[PDB]
Design an enzyme around this catalytic site. Structure first.
Site, PDB file in Angstrom:
ATOM      1  N   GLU A  72      22.333  10.224  13.968  1.00 45.66           N
ATOM      2  CA  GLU A  72      22.734  11.327  14.855  1.00 45.66           C
ATOM      3  C   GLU A  72      23.628  12.328  14.072  1.00 45.66           C
ATOM      4  OE1 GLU A  72      26.300  12.358  16.962  1.00 45.66           O
ATOM      5  OE2 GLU A  72      25.737  10.602  18.169  1.00 45.66           O
ATOM      6  N   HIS A  73      24.705  11.823  13.432  1.00 42.66           N
ATOM      7  CA  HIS A  73      25.615  12.630  12.607  1.00 42.66           C
ATOM      8  C   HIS A  73      24.880  13.338  11.439  1.00 42.66           C
ATOM      9  CE1 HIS A  73      29.908  11.735  13.756  1.00 42.66           C
ATOM     10  NE2 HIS A  73      29.215  11.056  14.675  1.00 42.66           N
ATOM     11  N   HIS A 112      23.721   5.898  15.352  1.00 42.39           N
ATOM     12  CA  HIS A 112      24.793   6.879  15.456  1.00 42.39           C
ATOM     13  C   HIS A 112      25.007   7.602  14.128  1.00 42.39           C
ATOM     14  CE1 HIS A 112      29.268   7.672  15.168  1.00 42.39           C
ATOM     15  NE2 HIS A 112      28.912   8.563  16.090  1.00 42.39           N
ATOM     16  N   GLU A 154      29.993  11.577   5.414  1.00 43.25           N
ATOM     17  CA  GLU A 154      29.936  11.199   6.846  1.00 43.25           C
ATOM     18  C   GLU A 154      30.576   9.871   7.150  1.00 43.25           C
ATOM     19  OE1 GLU A 154      29.312  12.911  10.040  1.00 43.25           O
ATOM     20  OE2 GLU A 154      29.507  14.364   8.394  1.00 43.25           O
TER      21      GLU A 154
HETATM   22 ZN   LIG Z   1      29.982  10.559  16.575  1.00 38.12          ZN
END
Ligand SMILES: [Zn+2]
Ligand SMILES: [Cl-]
Ligand SMILES: [Cl-]
EC number: 3.4.24.-
Length: 905
Positions: A57-58, A54, A134
Site C-alpha cells: 500500500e505504502h 500494508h 519506507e
Molecule cells: Zn500506513
C-alpha cells in the site's frame, strides 16, 4: 428470496476481469470519488509476509514506471491534490483501497488521475532505495501511535479475536518483517493479488453514466487479463468458554464493566437475513433506549452511562457487547447495574411499547433519509458501496430500505426478540471485561468468582418488570381552511343532511337517552361489483386486511393502544354495491372517532402477514372443496342462476398474483371519491363542536383518481335450469328452488312490508305441510331477497329430506305456494305481523349502533335515509287487499326458475 440493487447504481465487468460501480451524486457539486479497491488485505499474508499487504500500500506512492520515486505525489500536487486531504490509501484485513476525491470540471486532470490508477494496478517498481526508506516511515508511524486506545484494543484482541485468522494477521504486521522484507517479496505479493479480476473501480459523484464509463474503459481496459491468486477463507471457530480480563491503563479516562458475546454475522442478501440482522440490531437499540430512559428518569444515579454495540471481528463474525460506565471508581455499582439490567431482560423481555418506539424512531429516520438522499455525505455513500462490493451484498436505495423495513419488520415480535435474547444469553463464546485507570478502581474491580457470584444473585432474584413510558400517540389531521358546509336540509324530525364543499354527504341524528356513545358510519356507493372477474372475490379480503393494519404513522399495535386510550372501535364490511366503515367513540371525546374515520380513508396501510394468511386460507379452501359438498353445490348453483364470469372461483395463480400492494390499491378505490360517501353520525354532541369536526375531518378528504364506475349487478341467466348432482356421501337430499321476478316499478318500503308479511304466512304453510307432515322434510326454508339495482325479486325455497321423497316434496311445496298465493293473507296474519314489527320499531331508536344501521339500511335499500321514519304510519295503513294486490303484482309469474338437487352418490 433476493434483494433489489439501487436503480441509480450501474455495475459491470470489463473483458480483462475488472469490476466497476458507478453511482451518480451531486451533494458536493462537480465533485467525484475515484476508488480502486483490491479484494485482498492482511488475512491473505503468508507466515513470512506479515505486514507485506500494508507495505505494498505504502510502496504505491514510492515509484512506478512513468512516475519513479516521489513523482506521483508531485503530479497530484500539480492538480491541487494532497495526500491526506484529497488522496488516501488504507489496508485492512479484508482489502486494500486507493482513494482520490477531485473536481469534475477539469477533464485532463480526471485523465491523469485515471492514468495514475492504471499504473498502481501493475506498474509499481519497488526500488531497493525506496523500499529501505519506507521501512523507517512504517516503523516510526507504528511507534508513534501507541496511545491509551491502541493499548486498550491490543489488550482486548486475544479475547475479541479468539480463533480468527484476524488474530494472527494485524495489517501492520511484524516490525522484524518490515525491516527484512526484500523488494522481490513485495513484488511477489503485488503480482499475486494486484490483478484485474481481484479489483473493483468505484466512481461516485457528479458525472453521467456515459462519461464515467468512458473514464474507466479508456484507461483500465488495457490492463492484461491476468488471474489473481484465489482469496482464502478462514471460518471462525466458536470459543465456547467464558474469559475474564481487567484492562489497567492510567491514560484511559472512563472506568467500567462490559460483557462481550461472539456470534456469527450474516450477510444481508435476502428477506430472511435482512430480518435476522434487524433482530440483533433491535436488541441493541432496545437496550440503549431502556438505558437512556432509566438514566434520564434518575433510576440509575450509581452510574455515568452505558451502551450496547455490535462490531465486526472477522468476515463471518461479530461481537455484541453491553457496557456500563462507572461513576468515578464505583466498580461494584457498575457491575450491579449491568447485571441487574441483563437479568431484568432475561425475566421480562421488552414490552410492545418498547419495540414500537424503536421501530417508529427508525422508520422516521428512514423517511427523512428518502427525502434528503440528494444531500447524502459523498464519503459515507462511497464507503457504503465499497462495503457492498467487498461482502458481495446488494446496495439498497434509501427508498428500498424504507419499504423493506416497514414490510419485513412486521415479522419481528416481542416473542421473536425474546428467543433471540435467550439464544444470546445461552451463548458460551463470551468474556467479561473491566476497565480501571487507577489503584482505587483496580482494588474494587471484581474477580472472575465475584462476577459469577453476582450473576447467580440476580438470576435467583424475582426482579420487578420495567414499565416503559411509551410515546404520546395522536392521529391529528391538519384542517383544510377551504372546507365548508355547502347545503343543509331537514329529512325527518330527528334527521339532518349536510353536503360538504368536497361533495360528501353527512346524515345527523340524535339518540334519545344519555348512552354517551357516538357512531360514525362512512357509507360508500362502491362495492365488490365495481371490479373485474379476477378481483370481485378478493375485495372483502383486501378490506379486512387493510382494516386489520395500521393507520397514518401508527402500527397495528400502536393503533390498538391509541384505540383503547381514546375509547374507540372500528369495523368495516364490503357488500356488492356498498362499503361500510363503522367507527364508535364517546360523546365527551368525539375527535378520535373522526380522526380514525379520516385516517382509515386517507392513510390506509396493509400488513403483509395478514394478507398472506388470507391468500393461503383462500388457496387451501379451493384445494379442499370436494371435502365440502354443500358449499361446492351452492357454488355450482350460484354459477347456474347467473351468466357472469365474476361468479367463478379464482384459481391458485389468481390468488397469488393479487399482492398486498394490489389489495391496498383496490381498498383505496372504495372511499376514493368523497362525492360517493355518506357519513351517518348518530349520538348526542353539541352541533357547533360537531360541525367543526365534520369540516376538519370529513370536509378535508380530497378526490383520489379511480377508474371505478357504479357497480354492475350480476348478469342473470336468461334460461331456466333443473340440475341434479350426485355428490353427497350422506343420506340427505338437499333441494333448492329459486324463482326470479322482475320489478316493473322499484320496491319501496310499503311493498317490502307487504311481500315480507306474505312470506311470513308462506313460510308457515311450508313448515306445517312439508316438515310437520309425516315422513316429510328434515328442514324447510322460505326466504325472499330484493335487488333494487337489478330491479328484481328472488324467492328461495330450500329443504332437506330423505332422497326417495325429493320429487314428491318439491311438487307439494309448489302446490302449497300456489294455494297461499291465491288465498292471500288473513286479517289474523296481518295483525300478527303488524304487532311484531311495531315492537321492533319502538326498539329501533334504542341503541346508537342500531339507529345508525337503520339509517344505513334505508339509504341502501330505498335510496332515501329517511324512509324508515314513515314506517309506523305505513304499518297501520297495511290492509289485506293492499298486501294481496302487491303479491299479485310482484309474485304472480316468474321470469326464471332455477332448481338444484344434491343427492347421495
Ligand atoms: Zn500506513
Ligand atoms: Cl512488531
Ligand atoms: Cl450485510
Amino acid at each position: 428470496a433476493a434483494l433489489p440493487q439501487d436503480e441509480k447504481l450501474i455495475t459491470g465487468q470489463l473483458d480483462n476481469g475488472l469490476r466497476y460501480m458507478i453511482y451518480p451524486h451531486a451533494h458536493p457539486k462537480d465533485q467525484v470519488n475515484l476508488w480502486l479497491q483490491i479484494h485482498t488485505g492482511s488475512l491473505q499474508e503468508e507466515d513470512n509476509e506479515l505486514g507485506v499487504a500494508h507495505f505494498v500500500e505504502h510502496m504505491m506512492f514510492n515509484g512506478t514506471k512513468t512516475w519513479p520515486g516521489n513523482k506521483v505525489i508531485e503530479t497530484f500536487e500539480s492538480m491541487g491534490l494532497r495526500f491526506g486531504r484529497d488522496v488516501n490509501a488504507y489496508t485492512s484485513y479484508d482489502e486494500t483501497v486507493y482513494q482520490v476525491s477531485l473536481p469534475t470540471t477539469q477533464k485532463q486532470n480526471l485523465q491523469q488521475v485515471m492514468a495514475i490508477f492504471s499504473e498502481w494496478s501493475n506498474a509499481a517498481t519497488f526500488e531497493k532505495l525506496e523500499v529501505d526508506a519506507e521501512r523507517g516511515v512504517i516503523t516510526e508511524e507504528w511507534r508513534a501511535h501507541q496511545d491509551a486506545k491502541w493499548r486498550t484494543s491490543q489488550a482486548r484482541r486475544p479475547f475479541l479475536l479468539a480463533n480468527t485468522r484476524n488474530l494472527d494477521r494485524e495489517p501492520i504486521g511484524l516490525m522484524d518483517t518490515v525491516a527484512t522484507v526484500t523488494p522481490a517479496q513485495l513484488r511477489q505479493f503485488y503480482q499475486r493479488w494486484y490483478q484485474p479480476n481481484n479489483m473493483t473501480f468505484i466512481v461516485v459523484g457528479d458525472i453521467d453514466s456515459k462519461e464515467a464509463l468512458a473514464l474507466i474503459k479508456d484507461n483500465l481496459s488495457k490492463l492484461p487479463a491476468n488471474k489473481a491468486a484465489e482469496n482464502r477463507v478462514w471460518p471462525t471457530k466458536a470459543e465456547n468458554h467464558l474469559r475474564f480480563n481487567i484492562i489497567n491503563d492510567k491514560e484511559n479516562r472512563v472506568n467500567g464493566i462490559a460483557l462481550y458475546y461472539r456470534l456469527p454475522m450474516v450477510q444481508v442478501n435476502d428477506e430472511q437475513s435482512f430480518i435476522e440482522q434487524a433482530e440483533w440490531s433491535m436488541l441493541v437499540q432496545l437496550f440503549n433506549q431502556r438505558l437512556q430512559e432509566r438514566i434520564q428518569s434518575g433510576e440509575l444515579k450509581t452510574i455515568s452511562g452505558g451502551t450496547a454495540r455490535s462490531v465486526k471481528i472477522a468476515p463471518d463474525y461479530q461481537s455484541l457487547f453491553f457496557r456500563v460506565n462507572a461513576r468515578d471508581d464505583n466498580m461494584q455499582d457498575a457491575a450491579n447495574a449491568l447485571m441487574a439490567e441483563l437479568a431484568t431482560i432475561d425475566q421480562h423481555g421488552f414490552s410492545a411499547e418498547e419495540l414500537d418506539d424503536v421501530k417508529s424512531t427508525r422508520l422516521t429516520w428512514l423517511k427523512n433519509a428518502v427525502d434528503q438522499q440528494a444531500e447524502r455525505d459523498l464519503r459515507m455513500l462511497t464507503s457504503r458501496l465499497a462495503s457492498s462490493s467487498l461482502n458481495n451484498t446488494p446496495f439498497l436505495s434509501p427508498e428500498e430500505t424504507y419499504q423493506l423495513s416497514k414490510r419485513l419488520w412486521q415479522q419481528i415480535t416481542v416473542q421473536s426478540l425474546a428467543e433471540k435474547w435467550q439464544q444470546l444469553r445461552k451463548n458460551q463464546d463470551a468474556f467479561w471485561e473491566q476497565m480501571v485507570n487507577n489503584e482505587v478502581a483496580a482494588k474494587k474491580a471484581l474477580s472472575p468468582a465475584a462476577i459469577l457470584a453476582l450473576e447467580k444473585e440476580y438470576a435467583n432474584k424475582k426482579l420487578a418488570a420495567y414499565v416503559f413510558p411509551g410515546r404520546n400517540l395522536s392521529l391529528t389531521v391538519d384542517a383544510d381552511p377551504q372546507a365548508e358546509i355547502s347545503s343543509k336540509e331537514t329529512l325527518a324530525e330527528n334527521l339532518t343532511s349536510l353536503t360538504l364543499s368536497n361533495g360528501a354527504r353527512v346524515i345527523l341524528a340524535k339518540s334519545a337517552g344519555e348512552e354517551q356513545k357516538l357512531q360514525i358510519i362512512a357509507v360508500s356507493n362502491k362495492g365488490d361489483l365495481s371490479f373485474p372477474a379476477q378481483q370481485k372475490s378478493l375485495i372483502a379480503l383486501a378490506n379486512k386486511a387493510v382494516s386489520g393494519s395500521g393507520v397514518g404513522e401508527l402500527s397495528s399495535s400502536s393503533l390498538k393502544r391509541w384505540s383503547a386510550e381514546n375509547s374507540v372501535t372500528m369495523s368495516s364490511k364490503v357488500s356488492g354495491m356498498n362499503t361500510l366503515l363503522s367507527v364508535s367513540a364517546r360523546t365527551n371525546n368525539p375527535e378520535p372517532g373522526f380522526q380514525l374515520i379520516n385516517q382509515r380513508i386517507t392513510h390506509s396501510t396493509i400488513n403483509d402477514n395478514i394478507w398472506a394468511s388470507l391468500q393461503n386460507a383462500q388457496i387451501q379452501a379451493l384445494k379442499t372443496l370436494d371435502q365440502r359438498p354443500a358449499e361446492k353445490f351452492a357454488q355450482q348453483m350460484y354459477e347456474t342462476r347467473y351468466a357472469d364470469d365474476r361468479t367463478k372461483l379464482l384459481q391458485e395463480n389468481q390468488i397469488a398474483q393479487f399482492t398486498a400492494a394490489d389489495a391496498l390499491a383496490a381498498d383505496r378505490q372504495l372511499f376514493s371519491s368523497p362525492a360517493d360517501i355518506t357519513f351517518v353520525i348518530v349520538g348526542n354532541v353539541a352541533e357547533d363542536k360537531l360541525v367543526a369536526l365534520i369540516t376538519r375531518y370529513l370536509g378535508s378528504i380530497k378526490h383520489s383518481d379511480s377508474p371505478l364506475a357504479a357497480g354492475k349487478p350480476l348478469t342473470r341467466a336468461t334460461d331456466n335450469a333443473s340440475v341434479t348432482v350426485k355428490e353427497q356421501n350422506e343420506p340427505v337430499a338437499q333441494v333448492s328452488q329459486w324463482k326470479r321476478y322482475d320489478s316493473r316499478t322499484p320496491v319501496n318500503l310499503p311493498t317490502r312490508m307487504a311481500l315480507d308479511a306474505f312470506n311470513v304466512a308462506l313460510a308457515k304453510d311450508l313448515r306445517v305441510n312439508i316438515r310437520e307432515q309425516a315422513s316429510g322434510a328434515y328442514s324447510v326454508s322460505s326466504r325472499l331477497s330484493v335487488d333494487p339495482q337489478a330491479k328484481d325479486i328472488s324467492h328461495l325455497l330450500a329443504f332437506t329430506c330423505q332422497p326417495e321423497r325429493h320429487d314428491e316434496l318439491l311438487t307439494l311445496a309448489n302446490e302449497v305456494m300456489v294455494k297461499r298465493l291465491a288465498k292471500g293473507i288473513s286479517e289474523q296474519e296481518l295483525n300478527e305481523y303488524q304487532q311484531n314489527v311495531q315492537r321492533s320499531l319502538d326498539i329501533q331508536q334504542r341503541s346508537v349502533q342500531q339507529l345508525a344501521n337503520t339509517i344505513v339500511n334505508s339509504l341502501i335499500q330505498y335510496d332515501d335515509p329517511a324512509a324508515w321514519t314513515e314506517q309506523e304510519q305505513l304499518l297501520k295503513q297495511m290492509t289485506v287487499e293492499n298486501v294481496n294486490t302487491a303479491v299479485k303484482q310482484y309474485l304472480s309469474h316468474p321470469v326464471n326458475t332455477y332448481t338444484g338437487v344434491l343427492l347421495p352418490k
